[PDB]
Amino acid sequence: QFNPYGDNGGTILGIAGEDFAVLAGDTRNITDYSINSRYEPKVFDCGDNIVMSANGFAADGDALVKRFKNSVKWYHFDHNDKKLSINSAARNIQHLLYGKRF
Amino acid sequence: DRGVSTFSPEGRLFQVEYSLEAIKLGSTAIGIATKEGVVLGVEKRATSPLLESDSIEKIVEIDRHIGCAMSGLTADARSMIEHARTAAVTHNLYYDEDINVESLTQSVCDLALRFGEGASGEERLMSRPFGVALLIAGHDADDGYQLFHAEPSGTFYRYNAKAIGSGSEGAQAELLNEWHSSLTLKEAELLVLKILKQVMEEKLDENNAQLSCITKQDGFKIYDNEKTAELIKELKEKEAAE
Amino acid sequence: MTDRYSFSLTTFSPSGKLGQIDYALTAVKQGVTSLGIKATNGVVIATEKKSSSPLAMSETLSKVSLLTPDIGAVYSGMGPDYRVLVDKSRKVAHTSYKRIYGEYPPTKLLVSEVAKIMQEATQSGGVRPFGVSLLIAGHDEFNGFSLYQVDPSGSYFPWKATAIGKGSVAAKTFLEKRWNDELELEDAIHIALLTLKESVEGEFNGDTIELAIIGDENPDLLGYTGIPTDKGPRFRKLTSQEINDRLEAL
Amino acid sequence: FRNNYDGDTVTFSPTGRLFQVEYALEAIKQGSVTVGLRSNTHAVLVALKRNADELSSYQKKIIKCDEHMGLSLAGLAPDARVLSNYLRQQCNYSSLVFNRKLAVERAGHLLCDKAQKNTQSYGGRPYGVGLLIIGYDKSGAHLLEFQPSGNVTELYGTAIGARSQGAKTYLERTLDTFIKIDGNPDELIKAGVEAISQSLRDESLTVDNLSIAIVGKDTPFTIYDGEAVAKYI
Amino acid sequence: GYDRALSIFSPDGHIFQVEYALEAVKRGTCAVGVKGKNCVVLGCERRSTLKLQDTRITPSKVSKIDSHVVLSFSGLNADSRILIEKARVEAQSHRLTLEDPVTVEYLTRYVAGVQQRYTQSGGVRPFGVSTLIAGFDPRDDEPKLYQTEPSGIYSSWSAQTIGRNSKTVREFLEKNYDRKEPPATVEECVKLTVRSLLEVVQTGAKNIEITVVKPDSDIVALSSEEINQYVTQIEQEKQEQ
Amino acid sequence: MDIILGIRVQDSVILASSKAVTRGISVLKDSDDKTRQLSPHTLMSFAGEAGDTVQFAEYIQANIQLYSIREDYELSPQAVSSFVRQELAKSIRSRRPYQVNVLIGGYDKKKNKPELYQIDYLGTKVELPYGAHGYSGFYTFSLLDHHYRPDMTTEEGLDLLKLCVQELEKRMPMDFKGVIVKIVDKDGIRQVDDFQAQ
Amino acid sequence: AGYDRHITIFSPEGRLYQVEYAFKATNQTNINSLAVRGKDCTVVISQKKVPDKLLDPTTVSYIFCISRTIGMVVNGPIPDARNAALRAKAEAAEFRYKYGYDMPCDVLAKRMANLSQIYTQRAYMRPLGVILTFVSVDEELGPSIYKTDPAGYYVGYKATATGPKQQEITTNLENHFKKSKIDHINEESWEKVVEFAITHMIDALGTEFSKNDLEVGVATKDKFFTLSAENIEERLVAIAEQD
Amino acid sequence: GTGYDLSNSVFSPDGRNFQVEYAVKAVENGTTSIGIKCNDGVVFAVEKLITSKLLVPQKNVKIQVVDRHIGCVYSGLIPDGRHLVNRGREEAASFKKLYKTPIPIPAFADRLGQYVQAHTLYNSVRPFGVSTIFGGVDKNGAHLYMLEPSGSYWGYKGAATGKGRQSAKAELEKLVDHHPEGLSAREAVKQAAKIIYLAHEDNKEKDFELEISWCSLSETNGLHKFVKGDLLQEAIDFAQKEIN
Amino acid sequence: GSRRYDSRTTIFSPEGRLYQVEYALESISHAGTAIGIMASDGIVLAAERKVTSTLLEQDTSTEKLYKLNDKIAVAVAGLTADAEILINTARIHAQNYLKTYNEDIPVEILVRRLSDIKQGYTQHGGLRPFGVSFIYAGYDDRYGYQLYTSNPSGNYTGWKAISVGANTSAAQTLLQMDYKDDMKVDDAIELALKTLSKTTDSSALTYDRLEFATIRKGANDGEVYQKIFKPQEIKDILVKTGIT
DSSP states (O other), X not given: OOOOOOOOOOOXXXXXXXXXXXXXXXXXXEETTEEEESOOOOOEEOSTTOEEOOOSSHHHHHHHHHHHHHHHHHHHHHTTTOOOOHHHXXXXXXXXXXXXXX | OOOTTOBOTTSOBHHHHHHHHHHHTSXXXXXXXXXXXXXXXXXXXXXXXXBOGGGOOOEEEEETTEEEEEXXXXXXXXXXXXXXXXXXXXXXXXXXXXXXXXXXXHHHHHHHTOOBSSOTTSOOOBSSOOSEEEEEEEEETTTEEEEEEEOTTSOEEEBSEEEESTTHHHHHHHHHHHOXXXXXXXXXXXXXXXXXXXXXXXXXXXTSEEEEEEETTTEEEEOOHHHHHHHHHHHHHHHHTO | OOOOOOSBSOOBOTTSOBHXXXXXXXXXXXXXXXXXXXXXXXXXXXXXXXXXXXXXXXXXXXXXXXXXXXXXXXXXXXXXXXXXHHHHHHHHHIIIIIHHHSSOOOHHHHHHHHHHHXXXXXXXXXXXXXXXXXXXXXXXXXXXXXXXXXXXXXXXXXXXXXXXXXXXXXXXXXXHHHOOTTOOHHHHHHHHHHHHHHHOXXXXXXXXXXXXXXXXXXXXXXXXXXXXXXXXXXXXXXXXXXXXXXXXXX | OGGGTOSSTTOOOTTSOOHHHHHHHHHHHTSXXXXXXXXXXXXXXXXXXXXXXXXXXXXXXXXXXXXXXXXXXXXXHHHHHHHHHHHHHHHHXXXXXXXXXXXXXXXXXXXXXXXXXXXXXXXXXXXXXXXXXXXXXXXXXXXXXXXXXXXXXXXXXXXXXXXXXXXXXXXXXXXXXXXXXXXXXXXXXXXXXXXXXXXXXXXXXXXXXXXXXXXXXXXXXXXXXXXHHHXXX | OXXXXXXXXXXXXXXXXXXXXXXXXXXXXXXXXXXXXXXEEEEEEOOOSSOOBOTTTSOOSOEEEETTEEEEEEEXXXXXXXXXXXXXXXXXXXXXXXXXXXXXXXXXXXXXXHHHHTTSSTTBOOOOEEEEEEEOOTTOOSOEEEEEOTTSOEEEBSEEEESTTHHHHHHHHHTTOOSSSOOOSHHHHHHHHHHHHHHHHOSOXXXXXXXXXXXXTEEEEOOHHHHHHHHHHHHHHHHOO | OOOEEEEEOSSEEEEEEEOOEEETTEEEESOOOOEEEEETTEEEEEEESTTXXXXXXXXXXXXXXXXXXXXXXXXXXXXXXXXXXXXXXXXXXXXSOOOEEEEEEEEETTTTEEEEEEEOTTOOEEEOSEEEEGGGHHHHHHHHHHHOOTTOOHHHHHHHHHHHHHHHHHHOSSOOOOEEEEXXXXXXXXXXXXXXXX | OTTTTTSSSOOTTSOOHHHHHHHHHTTTTXXXXXXXXXXXXXXXXXXXXXXXXXXXXXGOOOEEEOSSSOEEEEESOHHHHHHHHXXXXXXXXXXXXXXXXXXXXXXXXXXHHHHHHHHTTBTTSOOOSOEEEEEEEETTTEEEEEEEOTTSOXXXXXXXXXXXXXXXXXXXXXXXXXXXXXXXXXXXXXXXXXXXXXXXXXHHHTOOOOTTTEEEEEEETTEEEEOOHHHHHHHHHHHHTTO | XXXXXXXXXXXXXXXXXXXXHHHHXXXXXXXXXXXXXXSSEEEEEEEEEEOOTTBOTXXXXXXXXXXXXXXXXXXXXXXXXXXXXXXXXXXXXXXXXXXXXXXXXXXXXXXXXXXXXXXXXXXXXXXXXXXXXXXXXXXXXXXXXXXXXXXXXEEBSEEEESTTHHHHHHHHHHHHHHOTTOOOHHHHHHHHHHHHXXXXXXXXXXXXXXXXXXXXTTTTTTOOEEOOXXXXXXXXXXXXXXXX | OOGGGOOOTTOBOTTSXXXXXXXXXXXXXXXOOEXXXXXXXXXXXXXXXXXXXXXXXXXXXXXXXXXXXXXXXEEEEEOHHHHHHHXXXXXXXXXXXXXXXXXXXXXXXXXXXXXXXXXXXXXXXXXXXXXXXXXXXXXXXXXXXXXXXXXXXXXXXXXXXXXXXXXXXXXXXXHHHHOOTTOOHHHHHHHHHHHHHHHOSSSSOOGGGEEEEEEEOOTTTSSOEEEEOOHHXXXXXXXXXXXX
């Protein structure tokens, strides 16, 4: 029977400094015991000085990143190009994720 | 008859223009923006001494940083206030932040032209335009203190000072001269109390008129009768002074 | 597109009249005459086959129609309207009755169903009343023989005998004179043929007249044998020949 | 005459006109002037913002649709919001689904078609706003003029609004000149401000009264207001 | 399917259908309400175009939305039912979710919203009704009296009247009601109510019904006699001069 | 399950309902009133699925109160019970049925007789001298089948329950934390605050 | 009030003007047609008039093949005629699918008549300004001709005619039958029936025809087809060697 | 009485539908456009009035393609024409999807026909304000069609609509008489350019821009393509020459 | 559009009156008169058949008195067909009530519901109101014998004696003149016939032109009985009361 999910491996790491922050991640993407790509970026610059990574099932991670970026875009369109604070992005992401609670 | 969303030969929407006429018949509402906050005042205008004047709610709270005054067919404003409140609260749930005053206003005006008997553009189920104009005043981190005039046309302008209702053309002229970029909050209060007095058919007292403001520090507050009464006294005095 | 006519086309005038129903009645008045006579052991409905051209085949056009095996109908007014009304009447006899109780509806109820359909076309949005008046004749075990009239308003009434259309006033009067509560079916068929002659301008024979009866069960018209309780339809349309035979005794 | 055939957009007059549409076009003329012109490397929008009182703001007339597209409005503001929002989605869809920036020519076709629908069906009303669209796509700089009639035209330059005729003749004259202002945005803008002023009469373009937008080769569609346009007055 | 805009603006800025809805109220029988210091009283007149009715079963003019709130009205009877039913349903829904009966202002705000909505929804005409809603908020003793009208506007009054000749009776109340000293008694409050109705009812012991509402769901309607008694004592106040 | 008992004596109906509310391993509350007054002379006890239980009770309460105000009259116990049965009978064939069992005890002012109705979540209704829902019935029906009399006074009825409750506290595996008893008669509904030792 | 002439509601005289005016439209094309029944075939004749020299004469027709066995000739504007044709083709295909046998000519006629009756009663649908003449050699009824109008009326004919000069053709045909005493052209071949049809079309209209002035459709057991300019020519020659 | 011309589906006493007739006026008031059927294809061409020097030349294209073998050109309310093509495109996509074979010209004509006729059946819609000339090459030949706001359409040897429809039709008729054997794709393209230049006299006031397109079994493989560059100039000249 | 043909059946007149309701009532005023009289031991319903003929089958006829419940009946004044529609929904409402509460529906509840349906056609939907007025005669264990009346507006009221239809003004005065609270069914039966006898627009008041019904609580039983008089029964009671 069809299983809508998959596991593309990889690991990501985020550390926050006093006036900086980093988001790291390996560039390997796999399926079972095979390597799909040795270089497939997984950490992204979404604008407004926000980097994000959705690790796990790649197709899902990509759709999420894509949706959030489009979110930032519309945030500007609707609030006079206001910058999206990180706390606001976080809350926004919560709704993006919880919207698919089932 | 003729479509509710018909254009006049001059390029105007009959229902929206006629809508504006109704608003002219409404009670005066005035708003003044100053680098110390925005003041919103309205003419209660009870229709009989037996009507308990303080049950006249023409100035309402959208959110802690956004207040609003109405003029015209005030019953038409209930669903607008509701939409505005929900919009503000909803924005805060999704983004964990206050909604910008301009954004909130743009949201309310989005309801404006949603009327007709089958207008091909979505599902604008509303038999007629709103018969009321609103003055939305507030404050946000990006553009400080703001005052907006939202009409049934769907358009909204930003004003330093603005008056709507029966005494508007008169009161607006007054505001033209009296308003300057360095007015203090107190100056604006007295100023609003003064102009209301000129246009009001009734002798302005702390019972047929009501003040309110919105300041970054304490947000939107509606002045209680006692507080305004003294401001009215302070005004009579400064006037008799010269 | 989309029927945006969701408001009534029939409304009350200051005088209290419902114009469209009145006008529909006027259409009925212009229609060819039709009638019905109730006997003690049967009912007869008849009308004139006003062929619209000698090239037309009048048989291929029945003004008299079977609704259920014990119920028939005839009309006066707008033919097309009648046709669709018969289609609906035949179907409602099933959907609202045979399929529930397993037996055909008694004449009064089917008439009531038809009447309902017509009443609705008097109040529903975007339509005009039916421009016809029907005369339905039938028989059911617990009510015996009956004859009803249904007007464009949806109102209906039971009759001993009556006529509608062109010379209804004249025909009704002629019937009142010849009717009695002891008429046998053949007597009514005769009285029917006489009344109809006064309303026909030209040829008057079994090819210009359409007549049917609700009488005894016709086991010969059932189509099968082997079930005692099933005796055949009571509704039978007379043949051109059967009519002429009765015309010579006119 | 006219009075019997202008009740709604679904009625043709005896001469083949659609008055409701024409009355819509009339709301545009009553609208503040705005100008559009392009070289081979850039496209510029210059718009005169109108104000109610001297206590009111000068209503924005330029809306960004995507990093490479934008327009200016003249007529019913709300209707431009609706149309621009629609254009923002069409642009957005093109990127998300095909990873392709929407061609300015296609944006026009989409706008025409959306407007057309509101002129053949009962109950609706034509849009009462004019639009000038500029953008830089895979075929260079572009300028489009959108009319509520559904008619969209690509031009080198143009203007709509009150007295728009002035700026229009000026550009039709300056044509050979500005069309060659490649590699130099400040010059195209100046050439635009000069075209727009050819429609003034009441006042003179001030700082909080002028609004300019530009897009091109290496310039994401950006709006300049106030102080930012001071250097052009 | 039917969605024609029946309530629309006219050149001078009026919604004629809502305006004509008020004319329907002007035609309805009079109704009044005066709040005492510890109660609210609702008076309503009874027509006489036809008399031979059965008062037991004929629907009364004052209706209970909940056990602590009543609603009287002037205008189309058929229309009032619709509003009364919705009000009653909302009353129960509110108890079910807030776990507390509605406040009079809340119940009023609700009825008003239903009326307002019917003034700008397609395919429907406004309610040809105006209401007077009175009672006591739960666990409160301060009397409450509100009024609503076709437009959807509502507000509180110390005393108010609607219906035919409401012009006349309002005058009476305006120069007979002191906010300084409101009818400190149920008795003197009921009296001030009948007096105001007599200004228009023209001798009608059986043409005047009264209902008294006290705190904590204490509601009761007076009988012909009880009322007739107030009329009697009132006519003497006149003759004794 | 919870203890839901009911007994109709001479001039009244007595309803005894367990006070415990247990979820898994913990007894969350020991003073729970598993009852809702539908009208001045009609009381309803209920037991069943966690949420459905109260939601249903309050829903029925709301509807009866609405009826009362619209008609300014109190529906007979028989009428209220028929309304509840139909509600449950609709429920059983819906997407997610209300898994609630109830006892409806009311005093019929028109007939001047107490009535006890037992209705399970399937919409099964039956009128009885005494009833119970769940496992209780297994030890209380034969008890009552023995010690019950139609002419019993309200006092004899309370003694009878006490006898039931004692049997339930001896043989039942669960600690239902006692019961709350309520009396329904010609004068309305009152609670016997003293059963913890009567 | 004065709108009882714009939509299909009754006029004080109990009339439906829109249906009457729809009838007017049926003559807008100034074309005449007639149909007659053979011993075992059905023929339909219709004037073909191509004014514009820029028109492709092959695409100008008012005769349609509704189904393998049913043919239909329309009298009225081509757009309404094509709307009626598509609907009839659909209706016939569905009928065969649901009931397992070919839709009979008279049944499709009744069905089309009922659809028309509806535009006669529902206000948002306008009547079609056309008259439909259906023909075939029914497996149960034999040669058949059923015609429907904007009133929702229909009936079968021994023969019929439609158009501006319908009356002249009708009386001509009537006379021939009063004479022959039978309800059909007693001819074994359809070619002779087609000739008879054209012959009387000429007498009645007092006009001569070239191979490009007519349009002919024939219906036989299991098939309905239309003739070509040449098949007609052959027909025109034949009649010429008799007069 | 009167007023029979205010609602779209209403029959006037003489059996007409005035709103459709008024739609025609909108058509006659529009630019002229034509279609010439050749021996193995069809040619489309239209007049493009140059309002000002501001119109970027060659950009505002009017001829529209449906699927890959059909060409469509129209005169009247341009936005209405686009609407009708959008429909035709769906109509075609639908047909191909179910039957695999790209839609035959006749079949496509009726699709457009029925849709247009549909807009003369209700008063809640307006008839189309355009007459459309379209055609292409299919399983059996080339086909040229013209569809009126009434929904009426026929097969044509040559067709024209718009301002100069008379000059055009006059010219087209000559061609039909002087070429019973059939014009050729190459020839028709030129002939077309001329007919537009001629038919432009009824609008000689404003300057214009020519636009031609064609579909020929031999010249374009049966696919609709626009005439550009050299072949275009060569036809522009053939006209400019015979205009004097 | 369609707006052109909309009568707007649900709008107010400048006087705040509902046009259609007012005109429907006008219609009702020409309907056969129907009378209802409530006595201490029962209720009487009598109605005059509008239009009749020698050939009308009176035995199988009913156009004014209908049974809704076993304890409730109505007398009709207006469009019979409109009445039947309302009567049927009324009959269903009575049964839903019974199936729900296992108790017969209280008279007022059934009357209010029916009146609410009418009120609806008054405030929304754009349809014409029902041209009907009902006199309800029922009995329940809460108010005993009851008499109600409802009309097109949706308003209903209770009465001791009342009339609907033609000449109500005359009939009401006659009733308001001889009615007495302590009357008896037989007295009411007589009062009813006399009233109709004086308000009829016909020559004489014969039995073939009448429908009669009484709802009594036959002492020898204890339950309520509805009796819809048969032709012969009306002919009798007609002679007895002295109308022969």
